[PDB]
């Protein structure tokens, strides 16, 4: 498979903004490269092939160029119709294949997350396995760290994070990272914490409770 | 002009045969090349296979072309032993191509017409209702928040909605995870004044329709 590589991964803009992004190819593929666009639940549309020809219907802002191993797509004067996830893709051969894509997001002002820990409901202990939940609410931007510590130790694994898309209103996001356990291990351990790293913290918060009080 | 529609069952058994068909519309159906891309949960577009309208002929990826199969109004895919791993949407598609000479030699495919995609999962769990657990804290600050742990149900997907719908404010319903049991679990958060957790009651409405499950949750300081 040739490989195809976008970068950035994500990038945050404002409308107004001039926004370019790179796709790189392991191998030439001269200009056969197209574009896409897709946004949350919809269908992908081309927006250029042949690297640089506009797709019919597809707005002038939009331009691609490069040949070869090297291709750009520009947006100029960014609109609000144009946060989405961009995807490039090369069919010089079998089997043609995708970039992972390019998330193109609203940028606003910095804000903390404001953190929260829930101990299991006494129900979940009763069930034998039991969920720890800390959430991470109206923050941006989107990169934010969470570490587990069970008695100040740093757990590892039996944890997974879920982000909501960015707020149609407030456009920040929020995040849950919730760690399963078995009761027998909840009960070995007393004291359950979530600290939290994020740009709009001067210093790691650590939100935490005492098993059983 | 062209319009391209996918259907077929959304749950497929490991080991069984995943068949997803698109209707072709508003165009000569002979006269292009359709096919098949799929995108898996957290993972990237992947071509499966083009072929061509009027003959049936086309080519199919290396890595899927051993239990794959296209056929043509309509197209059809059938994808033979199927994983987990095969759990995606699946794309109808037009696939375009251009002579490169000069010389007898093809490009391959780009794809000028999508349809919606059709979800499709591969699992071997049965259906089953959630489970619903309070999340709950806190005067000190002035806004606290509250929650409901959905979780351990299958198919997805689940509704949340907080004091039947009269709250809306501040909630936010994460995207279901899928655990290692097969099964799914998301949380319902929203945040709320502190003042208030002492007059107001809070309560996660619960809504599971492949099992007809509904559940509504007080939650409560503890």
């Known amino acids: 498979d040739i490989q195809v590589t976008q970068s950035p991964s994500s990038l945050s803009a404002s409308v107004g903004d001039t926004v370019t992004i790179s796709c790189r190819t392991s191998q030439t593929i001269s200009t056969w490269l197209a574009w896409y666009q897709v946004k949350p639940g919809k269908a992908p549309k081309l927006l250029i092939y042949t690297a640089s020809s506009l797709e019919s219907g597809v707005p002038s802002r939009f331009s691609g160029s490069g040949s070869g191993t090297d291709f750009t797509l520009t947006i100029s004067t960014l609109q609000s119709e144009d946060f989405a996830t961009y995807y490039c893709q090369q069919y010089i051969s079998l089997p043609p294949t995708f970039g992972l894509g390019t998330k193109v997001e609203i940028k606003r002002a910095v804000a903390a997350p404001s953190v929260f820990i829930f101990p299991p409901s006494e129900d979940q202990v009763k069930s034998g396995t039991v969920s720890v939940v800390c959430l991470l609410n109206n923050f941006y931007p989107r990169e934010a760290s969470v570490k587990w510590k069970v008695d100040g130790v740093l757990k590892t694994g039996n944890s997974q994070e879920s982000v909501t898309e960015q707020d149609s209103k407030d456009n920040t996001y929020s995040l849950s990272s919730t760690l399963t356990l078995s009761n027998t291990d909840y009960q070995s351990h007393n004291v359950y914490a979530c600290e939290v790293t994020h740009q709009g913290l001067s210093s790691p918060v650590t939100k935490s409770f005492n098993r059983g009080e | 002009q062209v319009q391209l529609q996918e259907s077929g069952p959304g749950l497929v058994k490991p080991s069984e045969t995943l068949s997803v068909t698109c209707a072709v519309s508003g165009v000569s159906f002979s006269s292009f090349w359709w096919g098949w891309i799929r995108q898996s949960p957290g993972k990237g577009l992947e071509w499966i296979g083009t072929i061509y309208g009027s003959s049936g002929r086309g080519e199919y990826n290396p890595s899927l072309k051993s239990r794959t199969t296209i056929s043509r109004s309509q197209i059809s895919l059938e994808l033979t032993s199927v994983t987990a791993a095969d759990t995606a949407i699946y794309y109808c598609?037009?696939?375009?191509?251009?002579?490169?000479?000069?010389?007898?030699?093809?490009?391959?495919?780009?794809?000028?017409?999508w349809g919606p995609g059709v979800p499709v999962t591969v699992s071997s769990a049965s259906t089953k209702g959630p489970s619903v657990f309070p999340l709950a804290p806190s005067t000190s600050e002035s806004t606290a928040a509250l929650g409901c742990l959905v979780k351990d149900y299958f198919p997805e997907p689940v509704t949340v909605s907080w004091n039947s719908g009269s709250l809306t404010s501040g909630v936010h319903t994460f995207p279901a995870v899928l655990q290692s049991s097969g099964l799914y679990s998301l949380s319902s958060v929203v945040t709320v004044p502190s003042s208030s957790l002492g007059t107001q009651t809070y309560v996660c409405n619960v809504n599971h329709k492949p099992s007809n499950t509904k559940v509504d949750k007080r939650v409560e300081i503890k």
């Open positions: 598609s037009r696939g375009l191509f251009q002579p490169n000479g000069f010389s007898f030699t093809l490009t391959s495919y780009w794809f000028d017409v």
